[PDB]
Amino acid sequence: KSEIAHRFNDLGEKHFKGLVLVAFSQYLQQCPFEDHVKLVNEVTEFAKKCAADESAENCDKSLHTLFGDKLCTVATLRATYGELADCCEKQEPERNECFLTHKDDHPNLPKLKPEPDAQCAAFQEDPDKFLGKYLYEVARRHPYFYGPELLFHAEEYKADFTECCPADDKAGCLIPKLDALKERILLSSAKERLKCSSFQNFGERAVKAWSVARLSQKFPKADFAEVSKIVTDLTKVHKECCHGDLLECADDRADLAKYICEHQDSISGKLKACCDKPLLQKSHCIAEVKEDDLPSDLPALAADFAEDKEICKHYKDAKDVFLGTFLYEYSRRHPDYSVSLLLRIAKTYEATLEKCCAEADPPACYATVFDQFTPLVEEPKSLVKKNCDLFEEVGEYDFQNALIVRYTKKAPQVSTPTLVEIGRTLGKVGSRCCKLPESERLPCSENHLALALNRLCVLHEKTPVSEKITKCCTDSLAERRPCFSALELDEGYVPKEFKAETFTFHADICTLPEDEKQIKKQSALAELVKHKPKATKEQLKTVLGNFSAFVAKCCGAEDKEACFAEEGPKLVASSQLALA
Numbered sequence: 243k244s245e246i247a248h249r250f251n252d253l254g255e256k257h258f259k260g261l262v263l264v265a266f267s268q269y270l271q272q273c274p275f276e277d278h279v280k281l282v283n284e285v286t287e288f289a290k291k292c293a294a295d296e297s298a299e300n301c302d303k304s305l306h307t308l309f310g311d312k313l314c315t316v317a318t319l320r321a322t323y324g325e326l327a328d329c330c331e332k333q334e335p336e337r338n339e340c341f342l343t344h345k346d347d348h349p350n351l352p353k354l355k356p357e358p359d360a361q362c363a364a365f366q367e368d369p370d371k372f373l374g375k376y377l378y379e380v381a382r383r384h385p386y387f388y389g390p391e392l393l394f395h396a397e398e399y400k401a402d403f404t405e406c407c408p409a410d411d412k413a414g415c416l417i418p419k420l421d422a423l424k425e426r427i428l429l430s431s432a433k434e435r436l437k438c439s440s441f442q443n444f445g446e447r448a449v450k451a452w453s454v455a456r457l458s459q460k461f462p463k464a465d466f467a468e469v470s471k472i473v474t475d476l477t478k479v480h481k482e483c484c485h486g487d488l489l490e491c492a493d494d495r496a497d498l499a500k501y502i503c504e505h506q507d508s509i510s511g512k513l514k515a516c517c518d519k520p521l522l523q524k525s526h527c528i529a530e531v532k533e534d535d536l537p538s539d540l541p542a543l544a545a546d547f548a549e550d551k552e553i554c555k556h557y558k559d560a561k562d563v564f565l566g567t568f569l570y571e572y573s574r575r576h577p578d579y580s581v582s583l584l585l586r587i588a589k590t591y592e593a594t595l596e597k598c599c600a601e602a603d604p605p606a607c608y609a610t611v612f613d614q615f616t617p618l619v620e621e622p623k624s625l626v627k628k629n630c631d632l633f634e635e636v637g638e639y640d641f642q643n644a645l646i647v648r649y650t651k652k653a654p655q656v657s658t659p660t661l662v663e664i665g666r667t668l669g670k671v672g673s674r675c676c677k678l679p680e681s682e683r684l685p686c687s688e689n690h691l692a693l694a695l696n697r698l699c700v701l702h703e704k705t706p707v708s709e710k711i712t713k714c715c716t717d718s719l720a721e722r723r724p725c726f727s728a729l730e731l732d733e734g735y736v737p738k739e740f741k742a743e744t745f746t747f748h749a750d751i752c753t754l755p756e757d758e759k760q761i762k763k764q765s766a767l768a769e770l771v772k773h774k775p776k777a778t779k780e781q782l783k784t785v786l787g788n789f790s791a792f793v794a795k796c797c798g799a800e801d802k803e804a805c806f807a808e809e810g811p812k813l814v815a816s817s818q819l820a821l822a
C-alpha cells in the first residue's frame with residue numbers, strides 16, 4: 243500500500259533518517275543544518291504515522307512526491323534557491339528532474355578542518371547531532387555521493403572519535419584517521435560520480451557494459467548468467483541512487499548483498515570475509531572486494547569468437563548477448579587490463595563483426611579479430627610505464643607539476659583552481675598506482691584517470707570553456723582517456739595578458755602548511771603556462787624552481803616582507819625572459 247511505511251519498515255529508524263538527511267543535504271546544499279534536521283524529523287514522523295495506518299490521508303503518495311513536497315516547504319526558497327523555486331511549480335517526475343539538474347558539483351564550501359577537541363566536545367554533548375552534521379557536511383559537498391556508503395563512512399567517523407576522544411593525545415591519533423577518511427570520501431565520491439555521469443551522458447547500456455567488464459574481473463569463477471544477474475541488479479541500485487531515490491537504493495542494495503552472500507560459493511572465494519559482517523560493512527566490503535583467482539578451466543576463446551562459422555548469425559540474432567558473453571569472457575581473464583581497455587577491445591570486436599559480416603567470406607575476415615587488440619593494449623602500457631618512470635624519478639610534487647603543465651597546455655581556458663586540482667589528483671594516481679606490482683599498474687592507473695577526467699568533465703559541464711574538452715567528454719566514455727592523451731597545445735589560444743600581481747609573492751605564504759604552499763606555487767605555474775604557452779616543461783621546471791628557492795629564502799628571513807618586496811619583482815621580470 244504505502245511506499246514510505248514500506249521503506250521505513252525495511253530500513254529502520256536510524257538508517258531511514260540517515261538517508262533522508264543525505265537526500266535533503268544533497269538536494270539543497272546551502273540550507274542550515276537545523277533546517278534539514280527538522281525536515282527529516284517531520285518526514286520521519288509521517289512515516290511512523292503511515293507504518294501504523296497505511297490507509298491514512300496521503301500515505302499512498304510516492305516517495306518523490308513526499309520529499310519534493312517537503313523540500314518545497316523550505317524557508318526562503320526564492321531568495322536562497324531562485325532556480326529551485328521554479329522546480330516547485332512542476333509535478334513529479336518533472337519536478338525531480340529539475341532538482342537534479344540544479345545540483346551543485348562545485349559549491350566550494352569551507353574545507354573541513356578537524357578541530358579535535360572542539361568536536362570531541364560536541365560529540366560527547368550529543369553523538370547523534372554530531373554524526374548527522376557530518377552526513378550533512380559531506381552530502382552537500384558531494385551531492386551525487388553513494389548514499390548507503392556515506393552511512394557506512396559516518397560509522398568509521400564515529401569509531402574515530404570513539405577511539406580517540408578519551409585518549410590523552412587527541413590530535414595525534416585523530417588527525418591522521420580523519421585525513422585518511424577524507425582521502426576515502428574523495429575517492430568514493432569520484433567512483434560514484436563517474437557512475438552517475440555515465441547514466442546521464444551515455445545511458446544504462448554503457449553502465450552495464452562497464453559493470454560486466456569490472457565484475458567479470460572481480461569474479462572470474464562466476465558464470466555468465468550470474469555476472470548478468472548481479473550487474474542487472476547493481477545497475478538498478480546505482481540508477482536509483484543517481485536519481486536521488488536513496489531509500490529505494492538502500493533496500494535494493496541490501497537485497498543484492500543478501501543475494502551475493504547466499505551465492506558466494508558460485509561467485510568468489512573472496513566473499514567469505516565480507517559475508518561474516520554486519521549489513522553496511524558487508525555492502526562496503528562486497529563493493530571493494532579484491533579480484534578472485536583465475537579458474538583453471540577458463541575456456542580457449544578462438545573457437546567461439548574467432549573460428550566458428552556461425553558467428554554472424556549469432557551476432558545478428560542476439561547482439562548485446564553475444565557481445566556481453568565476449569566481454570565477460572575477455573574480462574574474466576584480464577584483471578591485468580583497465581575496464582576502459584576491455585570496453586575498447588569489445589568495441590573493436592563489435593566493429594570487426596559489423597565489417598566482416600557484411601562481406602563475401604566473413605569467416606576469412608574475422609579469423610584474425612584477436613590480433614586487432616594488440617595496438618589497443620600497447621598504447622596504455624607505454625603511458626603507464628613512461629609516466630611511472632617519470633614519477634619514480636621526480637616524486638609527487640614534480641610529477642603533479644608536470645601534469646599541470648600538460649593540462650594547461652591542452653586546455654588553457656580552464657580556471658587555474660581547476661587545472662591545479664586536476665593536475666594534483668592526477669599525480670596522486672602516480673603515488674597510488676606506480677608502486678604496485680607491475681601487472682596491476684595499468685588497471686589502477688586507467689581506472690583512476692577515468693575518475694579525474696570525469697571530475698574535469700563534470701566541472702566543465704557547469705562552466706564550459708573549451709571545445710577540445712567538450713568533444714573528449716562527450717564523444718565516448720571508453721575513448722575519453724585516449725582522447726585527452728591526444729590533445730596537444732591548443733594553438734588558437736591567445737596568451738593570457740601578463741598581470742604581475744599573479745606571480746608576486748608575500749610573507750603570508752610562509753605560515754601555510756606544505757600542502758597549501760604547493761598549491762600557491764602550482765597555481766603560479768598554471769598562470770606561467772597561460773601567459774607563455776609555448777614554453778617547454780623543462781623551461782618551466784627551472785622557472786618554478788627559481789620561484790621555490792626565493793619563497794624558501796624569504797620565508798627564513800629576518801624581515802620576510804622586505805625580502806619578498808626587494809627580490810620578487812626582479813624575479814618576476816627575469817622569469818618572463820626564461821619562457822621565450
Ligand SMILES: CC(C)Cc1ccc([C@H](C)C(=O)O)cc1
Nearest residue numbers: 450451454562565566588589592
Ligand atoms: C548488456 C551489455 C553488456 C551489452 C554490451 C556489450 C558490449 C558493449 C560494448 C561497449 C560495445 O559497445 O560494443 C556494450 C554493451
Ligand SMILES: CC(C)Cc1ccc([C@H](C)C(=O)O)cc1
Nearest residue numbers: 626629630668671672687726727
Ligand atoms: C600513469 C598515470 C598516473 C600518469 C598519467 C597522468 C595523466 C595522463 C593523461 C591521461 C595524459 O597523459 O594526458 C596519463 C598518465
